[PDB]
């Protein structure tokens, strides 16, 4: 995934269709999605579990 | 340059409170986000605090929520993390991490060196 992501601040809709599912972490491949304070639409499809 | 330094690592029985800080080179630590990472021998990188740029809104993780103290002094240009008798289980080093300043270079993330507190 691109490591330049977080820096959208612009960013409305984010459609994330993956596996955010890694070793052993409460997804903190994702841990910069609070930058992202112009947010309307999420998408994620990784299998959450929780 | 950017690049991430941080201090007051130290081995502290529990009973006691520690002061950790940062120190970040090239960039306002106002105008951007902050995170705090634990690790631990044997286990990966685990969030534990983080504070939120234009507006100074402090995020937890249930693992330590409410027992922490995360402050932005832009003074000595640095983010000053307090904790409150942390329990031998809670031993990790410690990682700095702001990801996405004003700069946008090849590296989006910048880590601190890692600092190593120990409980028992």
């Known amino acids: 995934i691109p490591l330049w992501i977080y820096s959208l601040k612009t960013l409305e809709e984010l459609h994330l269709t993956g596996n955010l599912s890694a070793e052993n972490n409460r997804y903190i491949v994702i841990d910069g999605l609070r930058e992202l304070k112009r947010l309307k639409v999420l998408r994620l499809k990784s299998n959450l579990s929780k | 340059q950017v690049q991430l330094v941080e201090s007051g690592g130290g081995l502290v029985q529990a009973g006691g409170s520690l002061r950790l800080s940062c120190a970040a080179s090239?960039?306002?630590?106002?105008?951007?986000?902050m995170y705090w990472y634990r690790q631990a021998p044997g286990k990966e990188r685990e969030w534990v605090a983080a504070?939120?740029?234009?507006?100074?809104?402090?995020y937890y993780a249930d693992s330590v929520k409410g027992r922490f103290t995360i402050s932005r002094d832009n003074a000595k240009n640095t983010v000053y993390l307090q904790m409150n008798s942390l329990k031998p289980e809670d031993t990790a080093v410690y990682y700095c991490?702001?990801?996405?300043?004003?700069?946008?270079?090849?590296?989006?993330?910048?880590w601190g060196q890692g600092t190593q507190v120990t409980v028992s």
């Open positions: 090239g960039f306002p630590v106002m105008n951007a986000g």
């Open positions: 991490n702001v990801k996405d300043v004003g700069d946008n270079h090849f590296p989006y993330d910048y």
């Open positions: 504070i939120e740029s234009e507006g100074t809104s402090t």
